[PDB]
Amino acid sequence: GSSGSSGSGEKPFKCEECGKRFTQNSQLHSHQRVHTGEKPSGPSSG
Ligand SMILES: [Zn+2]
Protein backbone atom coordinates (compact mmCIF):
# COMPACT_ATOMS: atom_id res chain seq x y z
CA GLY A 1 0.00 0.00 0.00
CA SER A 2 1.73 3.13 -1.29
CA SER A 3 -0.17 6.42 -1.47
CA GLY A 4 -3.21 4.38 -2.46
CA SER A 5 -5.57 7.18 -1.47
CA SER A 6 -3.85 10.57 -1.69
CA GLY A 7 -7.08 12.54 -1.76
CA SER A 8 -9.28 13.05 -4.82
CA GLY A 9 -12.84 14.31 -4.52
CA GLU A 10 -14.72 15.47 -1.43
CA LYS A 11 -18.00 14.14 -0.03
CA PRO A 12 -20.59 16.42 1.64
CA PHE A 13 -21.78 13.41 3.64
CA LYS A 14 -19.68 11.64 6.27
CA CYS A 15 -20.67 8.86 8.67
CA GLU A 16 -19.81 10.27 12.10
CA GLU A 17 -20.32 6.74 13.42
CA CYS A 18 -17.12 5.45 11.82
CA GLY A 19 -16.05 8.19 9.43
CA LYS A 20 -17.34 6.96 6.08
CA ARG A 21 -18.37 9.26 3.23
CA PHE A 22 -21.04 9.50 0.54
CA THR A 23 -22.08 11.75 -2.36
CA GLN A 24 -25.65 11.72 -1.07
CA ASN A 25 -27.47 11.54 2.27
CA SER A 26 -29.60 8.57 1.21
CA GLN A 27 -26.32 6.65 0.97
CA LEU A 28 -24.90 7.68 4.34
CA HIS A 29 -28.23 7.21 6.13
CA SER A 30 -28.47 3.85 4.38
CA HIS A 31 -25.03 2.82 5.64
CA GLN A 32 -25.28 4.18 9.18
CA ARG A 33 -27.78 1.36 9.68
CA VAL A 34 -24.77 -0.96 9.97
CA HIS A 35 -24.03 0.79 13.27
CA THR A 36 -27.64 0.51 14.46
CA GLY A 37 -27.14 -3.16 15.27
CA GLU A 38 -27.83 -5.23 12.16
CA LYS A 39 -28.27 -8.79 13.43
CA PRO A 40 -31.20 -11.26 13.48
CA SER A 41 -32.60 -11.72 16.99
CA GLY A 42 -31.62 -15.19 18.15
CA PRO A 43 -29.57 -15.52 21.35
CA SER A 44 -28.24 -19.08 21.56
CA SER A 45 -24.90 -20.79 22.12
CA GLY A 46 -25.49 -24.36 20.97
ZN1 LIG B 1 -20.35 4.33 9.50
Domains of the chain (ranges, CATH numbers):
11-46 (3.30.160.60)
CA 33 to centroid of ligand 1, rounded, Å: 8
The answer to whether 32 and 17 are in contact (CB under 8 A) is yes
Contacts of 12 (CB under 8 A, 6+ apart): 23
What count of other Cβ atoms lies within 10 Å of the Cβ of residue 45? Answer: 3
CA 21 to centroid of ligand 1, rounded, Å: 8
Q: Compute and round to an integer the Cα radius of gyration of the chain.
A: 16
Helix (H) or strand (E) holding 28: helix 25-31
Contacts of 25 (CB under 8 A, 6+ apart): 13
CA 45 to centroid of ligand 1, rounded, Å: 28
The answer to whether 13 and 23 are in contact (CB under 8 A) is yes
Query: Experimental technique used?
Result: NMR
Q: Is 29 helix (H, G, I), strand (E, B) or coil?
A: helix
